[PDB]
TrEMBL record, chain C:
Domain Inosine/uridine-preferring nucleoside hydrolase: start-end pairs: 5-286
Keyword Metal-binding: yes
Protein name as annotated: Inosine-uridine nucleoside N-ribohydrolase
A GO molecular-function descriptor: purine nucleosidase activity
Gene transcribed to yield this protein: rihC
Annotated positions binding Ca(2+) 2: E105, E134
Species, as recorded: Limosilactobacillus reuteri
Binding site for Ca(2+) 1: D10, D15, T122, D227
GO cellular component, one term: cytosol
Keywords (A to Z) from UniProt: Calcium, Glycosidase, Hydrolase, Metal-binding
Database matches in SUPFAM superfamilies: Nucleoside hydrolase
EC identifiers of the protein: 3.2.2.-
Keyword Metal-binding: yes
Length: 296, 294, 297, 297
């Protein structure tokens, strides 16, 4: 048996590393990749997902999704224009075409086709919120959501908020209230998931995949974000977790905050997320190299 | 010329009267009816739209839409149709095998120009504009039942359709498509008189049907039908272009906040707000239109 | 045999008419007038209150209060600059001085001196919020608050909000949550309290007070009267239709300054914090206004 | 040879007791006044606790009791026994009485008496918000506010919010928008300010002050020290890493009580209102704490 997964992404170098591990691990069956707009437009994140899938010679379908957040106007200060949004390696132009259907339509069809799937959002959550609103019947087919985003110890857009949640707080609130079990892979662990200078050097000489990932990773040691959704699916024993109630702040100066009820004081003992609080960084490094060494 | 219109509804007696006028006026071509959940489930509002369309012998397609608001949990306040006072029978046909969003996307992209007429909460319109922003250049305007600039009905601050899905209303009001706001400011003045309702019941089969719905619960304020009355008789309304914001949290959740002084938005407007109505002409019009029907 | 009252004001022509009726009614004992900043700064509203009290020759102390709202920055487009903020009559320049103490300190001393008082806020509620936070012991001495402000049917700063609440929504929230009984005299009644052209003509020829009030009333220019309806409520509650309900104050977002009435009683388990004024006998308001001013200087 | 004039607003509290100990006894500091606010115990009990500490050192530095409740946010009753709120030592019953005036009134008089003072709030900020609203004239007399509270890396009431800000977010917003320079002594540094087992053992054997502080510090089973870091900042700012930034207070929603730092300087046109403490020399904090207490009774 393989675990059926669907990835919703805004590649993005971090998403490229997540997709690399998901595509190549033989215990995972990646059914579908959807994209959302982020630091580049949905047209560019779509092209980037196609570039990674084509690099591995796979025919995994890509569906382009939401061009904008539900409500929060996208910060143009965060919008890179006339660039790829996934720099540091030449993929060529031979990478194929997305589906004609939207990410929401593709998610609905791919989820309803499976008894059980794990959904893995590594961008802002706009497509997931739209999916759950238009097709709430998908939820019984989803075992778990393993989401990159949030922080319980300090943000990156402000002190209070992490990028994926901050980009579409309203979509994050819909996802966090949907009643599907969530694993929160936030900055609490991703800032600890330090790919060492020694690991990054070894990566660049390993094979064509290692050369590609080295190019993306070194373009700007490196904390790895989105790839920890896949590392959690394969090695949950590498993480320390805590079940808690998570609320999304959707306005005011703390817009985009993932607020954890760390005391369990306010929600009558109810939880909606398994929050990732720590990671084995040594095993993450060993794992990352072991996995890439088996690829092209 | 005929105006192409698409109606998004939660029938509902008020939506029944709106659909009746839209179906039967020869200057309007109703391409599609979509439904949303409200006082009753999306399954029941879908059945109610199909009952009205079938009553006039039309095969106007119905697509069932959103079962719940985007964010705000629906206030539960069993057994009921949600459109009582007339027996439509069995045999009213079936919805499309796609969502309201998918049906709206296909029907709007097939036309150069359409008018969109939401008479429920705005969930399907917000989902449509988020998933398919390419529809917006095909929409001349939105003529929306909802809001109030002079006192609400769910609270003092908020009208039902906006209150039910404030987040969807915000998405619709920020989408850049021209809006006409048909709020409580005019619908509470659109009083169908006791004399009108009596004449309606004896007029014909449509009059009998509308009489049955209208009198199920002296005179009745009519809501959603004023979107169609606006399309056909804009001269019967007093309007003011203004900036409208949607309050989406706090005690004033669901408020349509009009910048009545134009103090806060650098003179920009996103809505033509209906502030008054010729109630006498509304009554005369309502009877004249129904007299031409079955 | 007199009702002890304290007025917190931002005069303002409407507050001048309220103070006029309160000073001159023999069933009322106006112990103190406090001021808050509004369309003009607190120094100007203080001067305006002193002008009205000095016009009637009374001993009534004035204490200057808050210069700014608690939290919401005062909208500069609503600030009237290099002006009195009470135009249409020259009182001269011999109107006396405020107390040395703040409005809050003067309110605390005047309320604690009475077993029972009625508080009558006709500006924004900044002083009352500060008072209840610093000296919650005053609340057992207050029989009720009769407040000018709010709307349950359309605002004047936006469609959602009335000026006095809009000006300091956080102060209004503190006041509305304080557990002192409130009567809300909002735009629902004040926009119906239309002083007719016939009344305003008769007012100007009545006596010195009528001449002074005519000067203030007709400076911009029939006229809706606001703040004076707090005093008309105290003297003639039979002139009003009221409804006890739960009122929340919106303190942020586009509906900032909204008084939200739970008109269905759906959300508060049947609890009430305000008696909301919904209708007024405008004919009696006119008759009363003329009858009262005819008994003055 | 010259002293810094300071005023402390406190809710003692073991952490405030340690802050007051250092402030009372440092020869470069002149503590003019202590005010109190309600927190984990009532304002009556925090007042008693400040008087106990002052009396322990043979001083009669005045204490003025302040606000009994937050401005707006109902006090979380799960966060309020027949308990002192400062256990682990018998201070006896000879500790004297607070001033008759409120904290606000005492703060206004003490600040206006000085050309320059530093204000040091170690509780929730209710008294400071009321002070700045009623007496904005104090602000030109205040060089700086050195505040215990906030976090830019994880809270203690929720993931988003620290206790002092969470307790009265509205008061914290008024303080952060008042235009007086702020030094933020948040959980970023106070959770690193670990008084070691070795330090706490040496403290207990040092003298009567060390015995008293040992009693309070070891009552609940090193120890992170909070409020005392305001005084450690005043004396040894070189022991801290700071960054000027714009700080907003979240006053509603699930992130209520958050101190939101514009860490990118993306949203406020490069304007700052706070010098945020991000790191501390914990080794020097320990050395300093022992050196200071060794010079006391
Ligand atoms: Ca990403
Ligand atoms: Ca769709
Ligand atoms: Ca409807
Ligand atoms: Ca005071
Ligand atoms: Ca006034
Ligand atoms: Ca403290």
């Amino acid at each position: 048996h393989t675990t059926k997964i669907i990835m919703d992404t805004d590649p993005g170098i971090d998403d490229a590393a997540a997709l690399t591990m998901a595509i190549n691990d033989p215990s995972l069956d990646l059914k579908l990749v959807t994209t959302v707009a982020g630091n580049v437009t949905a047209d560019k994140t779509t092209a980037n997902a196609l570039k990674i899938i084509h690099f591995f010679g796979k025919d995994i379908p890509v569906a382009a999704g939401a061009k904008q957040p539900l409500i929060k106007p996208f910060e143009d200060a965060a919008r890179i224009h006339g660039e790829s949004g996934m720099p540091g390696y030449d993929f060529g132009d031979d990478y194929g075409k997305p589906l004609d259907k939207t990410a929401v339509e593709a998610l609905h069809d791919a989820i309803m086709a499976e008894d059980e799937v794990i959904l893995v959002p590594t961008g802002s959550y706009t497509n997931i919120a739209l999916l759950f609103s238009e097709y709430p019947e998908v939820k019984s087919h989803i075992k778990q959501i393993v989401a990159m985003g949030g922080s319980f110890s300090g943000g990156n857009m402000t002190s209070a908020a992490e990028f994926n949640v901050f980009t579409d707080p309203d979509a994050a609130k819909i996802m966090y209230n949907a009643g599907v079990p969530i694993v929160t892979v936030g900055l609490d662990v991703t800032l600890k998931a330090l790919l060492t200078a020694d690991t990054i050097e070894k990566l660049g000489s390993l094979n064509k995949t290692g050369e590609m990932l080295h190019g993306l990773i070194t373009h700007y040691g490196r904390p790895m974000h989105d790839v920890n959704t896949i590392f959690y699916l394969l090695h949950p024993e590498a993480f320390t977790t805590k079940d808690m109630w998570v609320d999304i702040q959707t306005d005011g100066p703390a817009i985009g905050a993932t607020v954890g009820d760390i005391r369990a004081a306010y929600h009558d003992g109810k939880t909606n997320a398994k929050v990732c609080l720590d990671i084995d960084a040594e095993y993450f490094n060993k794992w990352f190299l072991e996995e890439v060494s088996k690829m092209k």
